[PDB]
C-alpha cells in the first residue's frame, strides 16, 4: 500500500468539488440568460455521468458473477462508481423540477397543448405524466442505490470479516437478479428521460445502445483510473500485462457491441422508413448532425476498431489509455448526438452550457467517485482472486 | 511408417497443381455452359424445311 | 442488349441506313451515335433498363 | 486454492493424459461388430428420419412449395420457423466453441466438440431451408454475386441476401474451426489405431501434425483469432437471421431490439440443445469424469443469463408495442394475448419465462432430470417464440382483408420431423467416427490441474 | 539421411526447462513435438511469434473493402436499380454483407494460412519413423533437433541430450 | 416522364367484381381451385374488400378496391434477394417473373398483401387438380388461345402483383 494514496485521492476529491461546483455556479448563473438552453444542456450532461455511474454498477455485477482477475483491479473502482448513484439521484432534481414547473423545456409531453394536438403523445399519457414520471424516477434510484449500497455493505464486510461462500453466495444472489432489475430499470428510465424527449418517436433498442456504452465508459474508466493510479505510483499492485490485455479485450469487444446495437438500430429504421421511427435519425442526419453521424461510424467505431486489434496498443498501458481517453471524447460527442438533437431538431448548434455542465456534473461525479476511493483499500485484500493477483506480477 | 515418402509428391500437387486445374475445369465448364456462344448455337445454320 | 441499352451510341445508325445491310460502323461512331441519340430522343440508361422495357 | 478448486470441478477422480485419451479413444476405435448398441438402433432411426427428410424434399421439388400450407397473408411458415430455430440451435454451439475461448475458460473444453459439431449439423439441417423454401429452388445460385451473361446481381439490401452471406460464412467457418480443432486430435486417433486402414483414415484427415511449438504457437494464434472471428459472426448471423424480420415493416416484425434478442434466444435455445444432448452422452457413453455436473451448473447459468435477455425481449416488445400509439401494435398485444393464436404466446410465456425461471436455484441445475425438463421446454418453447414472431405478425397485419391462418400440412411436419433425422444421421456419424471431446485441450486441462497442484 | 537425436520426456515440466536449455546451447533448429500446447515453449524455442495474424488482417481488409466495393460497384456502376426507392449508395445494408465477407476471408487465411505457414499438408515427416512417436501425440514429449544447424553431429549432441533428463534418446532417419 | 398513378373512387364502387375478372382475362391470372382458396392462395391481382361498419344487424358495407398501390418507397422491393421486383423511371412497380426464385419475403413486407404467389403450378386448375406433376409442364391446348400474348403465363414458383397493366402501358 502506498502512503500517497489517501492524500492524493483527498486532493483529487477536494479539487473536483471546486471544479464541479464552480462550473455548476457557472451553469445556474448561465441558466438565467437562456432558461431552456440550460435544461437542454443539463440532461445531456446528466446521461454521460448517469451511464458512467450505472455502468460502474453494471460491470460490478458482472464482476461478481464471474471469476476474473480483471475486475478485482476494478472492484474498488466500480464500487467507487456505483455509489455515485446517490449523486445521480440528487442531481436528477433539476430534471425533476422542470417537470413540476410550467415551462415544458425538457419534456414536451408536459405541455398540455402538445398532448391535446398530437394524439400519439396523448395515448402515452398513461405512462408519460409527471405524477407518474417522478414516481417511476425514485423507483429507479431506490433500485440503483439499493443495489449499490448492498454491494458496498457486503464488500466492506469482506475486508472486515473475510471471504467465504457465506458472503460470495450473497453477491451472486443479488447480482444474479441484479442485472435483470438493472436493465429493466434502465429500459424504463431511458424511455422516461431519454426517449420521451422525442415523445412521438418510440423505439426498442434505444436503452440498449446506452447499455453497450455503459460498458465502454466503465471499461474506459477502468483503464484511465488504473493509469493515473499507476503514473503517480499509487496502485497497491503492479498491473499484470496479461490482465491489461483482458481490459483491452473488454474495451475492444464493447466498442464492437456498441457499434452493433447502434448500427442495427439504424439498419432497421433506415430499411423500413416508417414515419414514426425515422424522425429520430432524420433529425440526426440533417443540418450539421450528419457530421456527428459520420463521426460515430469512423471516429467512434472504425478508428478504435483498428487500433484495438493488435496486441500492441492493447497490451501496453500507455497506448490503451490513448484509446480509452479518446473513447471518452468520442462518447461525449455521442451523448451529444443522442440527447441534444431532441432539442432544436433542424440544425446543429452547441452552447458553452453544453461543455460547462459536463464539467459541472463531471467534477461533482469525479469528487464523489474520489470520495468513495478513500473508503475502500483499493485492493479488496480479503478476496479469493488476490492470490491470483499475487501471481502474474513475478512473471 | 504410415504414408511413405512418395506421398509428399501427392500432397503437394493436390493443392498446387490439382486445385488450379480443377478450377480450370470448373472455369471452362462455367464458360461453356453459361457463357459460350456454343450452347446458344451461333453460326450453326439451323435446317429449314 | 444491356450494354446496347445503357450505351446506344456505339450502335445507333441513321434511319435511312437501317435497312441497308452493307452499313459498317464508322471510325467516328461516337459523336455521331451520340448525335443521333439526342436527335432521335433516345431515352437514358436509367429509363431503358428497368424490366418493364423487357420482361412484362 | 480458489483457482485450483475451480479446475477440479471439471475432471473429478485421478486422471492422466493416457486415461483421458483412452476414454475418448474408446468411443472411437471400438470397431464395428464390437461397436456397442444404441448407436446401431439410433443410426437406423435417423435413417427413417432421413428418408422422411429426403421424401419430403422429393415431394417438395416435384409438386411444389405449396404442399406446406403457407397462405398468402402468412407466406413464411415452418420453412422459416424451423430455419431460425435450427440456426438458433447451432449458435450456442459456437458460444461454447468461440466466445468462451476468448474468456480463457476451461469449462468449455470438454463441451467443445459436442458443440462445434452440433453447430455444423444444426446448420446443414438449417441451410437446406433457405434453399428449399424458395418456390424455384434450382435458382438459389441467383442469390450469389457471380458474373453472368445476364447483367443481374443480387440485391444487397434484403436481409435474405445477407442470410446467404451469413450462413455461407457460418457454414464454412464452423467446418473450418471444428476441422482445425480436429487437426491435432485426429493425430492422436491416428497413433492409437494399430490398424493401417483406419490409421490412414485419421492420418489423412489430420494432415500430418507432429505437435511442435512452432506449430502449437501457430495453432492457438489461429484458434483465438478464429475464436475472435466466430464471436462477432454468431452475434451477427442470428442478427442477420433476425434482420429478415426486422427489415420488414410489419408491426410484430419492425422492432429494433430484434438483433440482440434473437441472438439471446439463440444462446438460449442452443444451450438447451447442448444440455439435451450431453445428459444422454454421460449415461450412455461413460463420460461422468469429463462432463462432470459443474459443466451443467455453468451451462445452466449461461442459459439462465440468456433466458432473461429474452424475458427482457418479451417485455420490451410488449412495452414498445404499447408505448407506440399505433393501432397496429396495440392490436399486436391484443392478438398474442387474445385472438386465434393466443395459445401460442401463452405456451411461450410458460415455456420460456415461467418454467426455466427455476434455473435460478441450484436444485434445478445440478439435478439432471430437472435440467433436462427445463431444457426440453426451451426447444419446444423457442420454437414457439419463432412461431409467434413469424406467424402471429404475418397472419394478422395492417389490412383486415388479408388475415390468414396457417394450419400446417403434413409436409411441413414431415420436413421438420425429418430434419432431426439429418441432424442425428450426422451426429451419430460424428460420435462414432470422430471424438466427442477435444482430447488435446482436455489434456491441457489435466495439465492445468497438475500445474496448479504443484504450485502448492 | 540422419534427422534425429530426439529425446523422449515424461512430463512437460521437464521439457520446457530442457527446451530453453537447448536455446542456451546454441542449437537454433529444434522442435518440441508435444501432445498439447505448453505455455512458454515457443518462448523457449525462440520462434518470436508468427506473421500469421497480419495475413488474417491483410485478407480481412481485402474482404471488408472487397465486399463493400462489390455491392457498391453493383449498385452504382454495373447495374444501378431503383429498388424500393432506396439510394444507389446505400451505405447501410452493405455493412451486414461486407462484414460477413470480412469474417470469411479472414478465416480462409486463418485455417489455410496456418496450414500454409506450418507445413502440415505433408505426410512422411522424418520424425514419424521414431520407436515411440505413437506416444508423442498421447503422453510423451520429444525434444528433437535437426541437421540444418552447423553445430550438430551425432556426438556433441547425444552426450548433450544425456546432460538433460531424457527417457530414450533415439536417432531417427529421413 | 410518364409518372403513372391511379385514382380509385370508392364512393361509386358497387363491388360488381368486373375489375377482378377483367384483370384475370387480361393478365393471364390462373384460376385456383376450392381447396387452395381455403388456404388463402387465390390469384387475384385486384380485390374488393367489404368491411361492415356499424351494428351487426343493420351495418354499412364499404368497398376498398385494394390492388398493388405501386408504392414509390415500395417495401416489397427492398426485401427481394435477387432484385426480381424493381421500379421503372415511369414510377410503377415492376414484378419480373423470370427472376423470382420464390422467396416469399416480398409478400411479407408488402403492407397491403397485394402480392400473390403461385404456390403450386397454378395452370388450368379446374381441369387438372394442381397437386400433381404428371401434367405440370403440359397445358391444355384450347386454353392457350385465351391467354393474352403480352403477359407472362407464370411458372410454379413465382410471385404476381398488379402491374398497372404494364403490357398496356408499354
Ligand atoms: C431489355 C434490355 C432487358 C432488360 C431491361 C431486362 N432484361 Fe432480363 N432478359 C433480357 C433478355 C433479352 C433475356 C434472355 C437472355 C437469355 O436468353 O438468357 C433476359 C433474361 C433474363 C433472366 C434469365 C431468366 C432465366 O434464365 O430463366 C433474368 C433472371 C432476367 N432477365 C432478369 C431481369 C431483371 C431482374 C431485370 C431488372 C431491371 C431485367 N431482367 C431487365 C432483356 C432484358
Ligand atoms: S372498381 Fe371493380 S368492383 Fe368497383 S365498380 Fe369498378 S369493376 Fe366494379
Ligand atoms: S405490391 Fe405492395 S409493397 Fe409492393 S409496390 Fe405494390 S403496394 Fe407497394
Ligand atoms: S422477394 Fe424476391 S425472388 Fe421472388 S417471391 Fe419475393 S420476389
Automatic annotation (TrEMBL), chain A:
Signal peptide: none annotated. The keyword rRNA processing does not apply. Keywords: Membrane, Transmembrane, Transmembrane helix. The chain crosses the membrane at residues 15-36, 42-65, 77-97, 133-151, 171-189, 209-229, 250-271, 291-310, 317-337, 349-371. The keyword Glycoprotein does not apply. It comes from the Bacteria. PANTHER family: PTHR43044, QUINOL:CYTOCHROME C OXIDOREDUCTASE QUINONE-BINDING SUBUNIT 2. This is Quinol:cytochrome c oxidoreductase quinone-binding subunit 2. The lineage of its organism: Bacteria, Bacillati, Chloroflexota, Chloroflexia, Chloroflexales.
From TrEMBL, chain C:
Heme c 1 binds at residues 51, 54-55. The keyword Heme applies. Heme c 7 binds at residues 5, 43. Keywords: Heme, Iron, Membrane, Metal-binding, Transmembrane, Transmembrane helix. The keyword Phosphoprotein does not apply. Heme c 6 binds at residues 1, 4-5, 43. Signal peptide: none annotated. This is Cytochrome c7-like domain-containing protein. The lineage of its organism: Bacteria, Bacillati, Chloroflexota, Chloroflexia, Chloroflexales.
From TrEMBL, chain D:
The keyword Transmembrane applies. InterPro entries: NrfD-like. It comes from the Bacteria. One of its GO terms (cellular component) is plasma membrane. Belongs to the NrfD family. PANTHER family: POLYSULPHIDE REDUCTASE NRFD, PTHR43044. This is Polysulphide reductase NrfD. It comes from Roseiflexus castenholzii (strain DSM 13941 / HLO8).
From TrEMBL, chain E:
InterPro entries: ActD. Keywords: Membrane, Transmembrane, Transmembrane helix. It comes from the Bacteria. Pfam families: ActD (PF11821). The chain crosses the membrane at residues 54-74, 94-120. The keyword Membrane applies. The keyword Ribonucleoprotein does not apply. This is Quinol:cytochrome c oxidoreductase membrane protein. The lineage of its organism: Bacteria, Bacillati, Chloroflexota, Chloroflexia, Chloroflexales.
Amino acid at each position: 500500500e502506498p502512503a500517497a494514496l489517501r492524500p492524493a485521492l483527498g486532493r483529487l476529491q477536494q479539487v473536483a468539488l471546486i471544479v464541479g461546483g464552480v462550473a455548476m455556479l457557472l451553469a445556474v448563473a448561465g441558466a438565467f440568460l437562456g432558461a431552456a438552453q440550460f435544461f437542454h444542456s443539463y440532461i445531456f450532461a446528466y446521461f454521460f455521468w448517469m451511464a458512467l455511474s450505472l455502468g460502474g454498477l453494471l460491470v460490478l455485477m458482472i464482476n461478481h458473477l464471474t471469476q476474473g482477475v480483471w475486475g478485482l483491479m476494478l472492484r474498488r473502482l466500480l464500487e467507487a462508481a456505483a455509489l455515485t448513484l446517490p449523486l445521480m439521484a440528487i442531481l436528477f432534481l433539476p430534471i425533476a423540477a422542470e417537470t413540476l414547473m410550467g415551462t415544458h423545456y425538457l419534456f414536451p409531453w408536459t405541455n398540455p397543448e402538445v398532448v391535446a394536438n398530437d394524439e400519439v403523445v396523448a395515448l402515452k399519457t398513461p405512462y408519460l405524466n409527471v405524477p407518474f414520471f417522478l414516481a417511476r424516477a425514485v423507483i429507479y434510484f431506490v433500485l440503483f442505490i439499493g443495489m449499490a449500497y448492498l454491494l458496498r455493505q457486503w464488500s466492506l464486510e469482506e475486508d472486515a470479516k473475510g471471504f467465504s461462500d457465506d458472503l460470495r453466495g450473497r453477491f451472486q444472489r443479488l447480482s444474479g437478479p441484479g442485472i435483470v432489475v438493472l436493465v429493466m430499470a434502465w429500459t424504463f428510465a431511458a424511455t422516461d428521460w431519454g426517449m420521451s424527449l422525442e415523445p412521438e418517436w418510440f423505439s426498442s433498442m434505444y436503452p440498449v445502445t446506452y447499455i453497450a456504452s455503459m460498458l465502454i465508459l466503465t471499461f474506459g474508466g477502468g483503464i484511465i483510473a488504473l493509469a493515473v493510479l499507476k503514473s503517480r505510483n499509487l496502485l497497491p499492485f503492479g498491473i499484470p500485462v496479461d490482465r491489461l490485455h483482458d481490459l483491452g479485450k473488454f474495451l475492444f469487444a464493447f466498442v464492437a457491441v456498441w457499434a452493433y446495437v447502434n448500427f442495427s438500430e439504424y439498419l432497421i429504421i433506415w430499411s423500413g422508413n416508417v414515419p414514426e421511427l425515422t424522425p429520430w435519425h432524420g433529425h440526426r442526419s440533417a443540418g450539421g448532425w450528419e457530421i456527428l453521424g459520420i463521426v460515430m461510424i469512423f471516429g467512434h467505431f472504425l478508428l478504435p476498431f483498428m487500433l484495438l486489434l493488435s496486441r500492441f496498443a492493447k497490451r501496453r498501458l500507455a497506448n490503451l489509455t490513448a484509446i480509452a481517453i479518446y473513447l471518452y471524447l468520442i462518447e461525449i460527442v455521442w451523448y451529444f448526438w443522442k440527447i441534444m438533437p431532441a432539442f432544436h431538431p433542424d440544425g446543429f448548434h452547441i452552447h458553452w452550457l453544453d461543455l460547462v455542465t459536463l464539467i459541472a456534473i463531471g467534477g461533482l461525479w469525479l469528487g464523489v467517485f474520489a470520495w468513495n476511493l478513500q473508503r475502500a483499500p483499493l485492493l479488496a485484500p480479503n478476496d479469493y482472486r488476490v492470490p491470483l493477483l499475487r501471481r502474474q506480477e513475478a512473471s | 511408417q504410415v504414408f511413405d515418402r512418395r506421398a509428399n509428391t501427392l500432397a503437394r500437387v493436390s493443392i498446387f497443381a490439382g486445385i488450379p486445374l480443377v478450377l480450370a475445369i470448373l472455369g471452362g465448364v462455367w464458360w461453356l455452359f453459361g457463357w459460350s456462344d456454343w450452347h446458344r448455337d451461333v453460326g450453326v445454320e439451323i435446317p429449314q424445311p | 442488349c444491356l450494354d446496347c441499352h445503357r450505351n446506344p451510341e456505339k450502335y445507333v445508325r441513321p434511319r435511312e441506313e437501317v435497312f441497308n445491310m452493307a452499313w459498317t460502323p464508322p471510325p467516328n461512331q461516337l459523336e455521331v451515335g451520340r448525335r443521333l441519340v439526342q436527335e432521335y430522343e433516345i431515352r437514358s440508361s436509367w429509363e431503358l433498363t428497368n424490366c418493364a422495357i423487357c420482361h412484362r | 486454492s480458489a483457482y485450483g478448486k475451480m479446475l477440479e470441478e471439471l475432471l473429478g477422480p485421478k486422471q492422466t493424459y493416457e486415461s483421458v485419451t483412452r476414454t475418448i479413444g474408446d468411443i472411437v476405435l471400438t470397431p464395428i461388430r464390437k461397436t456397442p448398441w444404441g448407436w446401431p438402433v439410433g443410426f437406423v432411426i435417423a435413417a427413417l428420419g432421413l428418408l422422411m427428410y429426403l421424401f419430403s424434399l422429393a415431394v417438395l421439388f416435384t409438386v411444389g412449395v405449396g404442399v406446406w400450407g403457407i397462405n398468402i397473408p402468412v407466406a413464411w411458415g415452418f420453412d422459416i420457423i424451423n430455419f431460425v430455430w435450427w440456426i438458433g440451435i447451432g449458435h450456442a454451439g459456437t458460444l461454447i466453441s468461440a466466445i468462451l475461448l476468448l474468456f480463457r475458460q476451461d469449462w468449455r473444453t470438454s463441451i467443445n466438440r459436442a458443440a462445434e459439431a452440433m453447430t455444423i449439423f444444426a446448420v446443414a439441417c438449417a441451410g437446406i431451408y433457405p434453399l428449399v423454401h424458395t418456390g424455384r429452388p434450382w435458382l438459389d445460385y441467383w442469390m450469389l454475386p457471380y458474373p453472368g451473361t445476364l447483367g443481374m446481381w443480387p440485391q444487397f439490401r434484403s436481409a435474405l441476401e445477407w442470410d446467404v452471406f451469413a450462413i455461407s460464412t457460418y457454414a464454412t467457418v464452423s467446418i473450418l474451426f471444428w476441422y482445425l480443432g480436429l487437426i491435432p486430435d485426429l493425430a492422436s486417433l491416428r497413433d492409437r489405431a494399430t490398424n493401417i486402414w483406419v490409421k490412414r483414415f485419421y492420418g489423412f484427415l489430420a494432415l500430418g501434425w507432429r505437435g511442435g511449438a512452432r506449430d502449437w504457437n501457430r495453432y492457438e494464434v489461429a484458434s483465438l483469432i478464429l475464436a475472435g472471428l466466430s464471436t462477432p459472426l454468431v452475434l451477427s448471423v442470428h442478427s442477420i437471421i433476425s434482420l429478415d424480420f426486422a427489415i420488414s415493416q410489419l408491426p410484430g416484425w419492425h422492432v429494433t431490439v430484434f438483433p440482440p434478442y434473437f441472438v439471446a434466444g439463440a444462446v438460449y435455445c442452443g444451450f438447451a440443445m447442448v444440455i439435451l444432448l450431453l445428459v444422454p452422452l454421460r449415461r450412455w457413453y461413460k463420460l461422468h469424469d469429463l462432463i462432470t455436473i459443474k459443466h451443467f451448473d455453468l451451462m445452466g447459468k449461461v442459459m439462465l443469463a440468456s433466458g432473461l435477455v429474452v424475458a427482457y425481449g418479451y417485455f420490451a416488445e410488449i412495452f414498445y408495442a404499447w408505448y407506440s400509439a399505433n393501432i397496429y401494435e396495440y392490436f399486436l398485444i391484443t392478438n398474442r394475448t387474445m385472438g386465434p393464436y393466443a395459445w401460442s404466446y401463452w405456451a411461450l410465456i410458460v415455456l420460456n419465462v415461467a418454467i426455466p425461471q427455476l434455473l435460478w436455484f441450484k436444485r434445478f441445475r445440478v439435478s439432471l432430470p430437472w435440467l433436462f425438463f427445463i431444457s426440453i421446454c426451451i426447444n419446444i418453447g423457442m420454437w414457439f417464440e419463432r412461431w409467434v414472431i413469424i406467424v402471429l405478425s404475418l397472419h394478422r397485419d395492417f389490412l383486415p382483408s388479408s388475415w390468414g391462418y396457417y394450419t400446417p400440412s403434413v409436409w411441413d411436419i414431415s420436413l421438420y420431423a425429418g430434419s432431426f433425422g439429418w441432424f442425428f444421421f450426422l451426429f451419430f456419424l460424428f460420435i462414432r467416427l470422430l471424438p466427442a471431446i477435444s482430447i488435446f485441450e482436455v489434456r491441457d486441462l489435466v495439465h492445468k490441474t497438475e500445474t496448479e497442484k504443484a504450485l502448492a | 539421411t540422419l534427422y534425429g537425436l530426439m529425446a523422449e520426456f515424461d512430463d512437460a515440466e521437464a521439457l520446457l526447462a530442457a527446451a530453453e536449455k537447448t536455446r542456451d546451447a546454441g542449437y537454433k533448429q529444434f522442435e518440441a513435438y508435444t501432445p498439447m500446447p505448453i505455455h512458454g515453449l515457443d518462448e523457449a524455442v525462440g520462434y518470436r511469434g508468427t506473421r500469421l495474424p497480419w495475413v488474417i488482417f491483410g485478407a480481412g481488409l481485402l474482404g471488408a473493402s472487397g465486399m463493400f466495393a462489390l455491392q457498391t460497384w453493383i449498385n452504382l456502376v454495373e447495374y444501378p436499380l431503383n429498388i424500393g426507392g432506396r439510394p444507389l449508395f446505400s451505405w447501410p445494408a452493405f455493412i451486414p454483407a461486407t462484414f460477413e465477407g470480412m469474417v470469411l476471408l479472414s478465416a480462409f487465411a486463418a485455417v489455410f494460412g496456418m496450414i500454409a505457414a506450418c507445413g502440415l499438408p505433408r505426410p512422411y515427416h522424418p520424425v514419424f519413423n521414431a520407436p515411440n512417436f505413437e506416444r508423442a501425440s498421447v503422453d510423451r514429449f520429444f525434444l528433437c533437433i535437426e541437421a540444418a544447424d552447423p553445430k550438430f553431429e551425432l556426438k556433441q549432441t547425444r552426450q548433450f541430450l544425456e546432460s538433460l533428463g531424457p527417457l530414450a534418446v533415439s536417432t531417427v532417419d529421413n | 416522364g410518364y409518372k403513372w398513378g391511379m385514382s380509385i373512387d370508392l364512393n361509386v364502387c358497387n363491388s360488381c367484381n368486373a375489375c377482378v375478372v377483367a384483370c384475370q382475362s387480361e393478365n393471364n391470372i390462373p384460376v385456383v381451385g376450392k381447396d387452395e382458396v381455403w388456404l388463402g392462395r387465390e390469384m387475384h391481382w385486384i380485390r374488393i374488400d367489404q368491411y361492415y361498419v356499424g351494428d351487426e344487424h343493420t351495418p354499412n358495407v364499404y368497398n376498398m378496391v385494394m390492388l398493388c398501390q405501386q408504392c414509390e418507397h415500395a417495401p416489397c422491393e427492398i426485401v427481394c434477394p435477387v432484385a426480381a421486383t424493381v421500379h421503372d423511371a415511369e414510377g410503377l412497380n415492376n414484378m419480373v417473373y423470370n427472376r423470382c426464385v420464390g422467396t416469399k419475403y416480398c409478400s411479407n413486407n408488402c403492407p397491403y398483401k397485394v402480392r400473390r404467389f403461385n404456390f403450386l403450378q397454378y395452370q388450368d386448375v379446374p381441369y387438372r387438380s394442381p397437386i400433381d406433376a404428371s401434367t405440370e409442364n403440359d397445358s391444355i391446348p384450347v386454353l392457350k388461345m385465351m391467354r393474352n400474348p403480352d403477359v407472362t403465363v407464370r411458372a410454379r414458383g413465382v410471385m404476381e402483383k398488379c402491374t398497372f397493366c404494364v403490357q398496356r402501358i408499354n
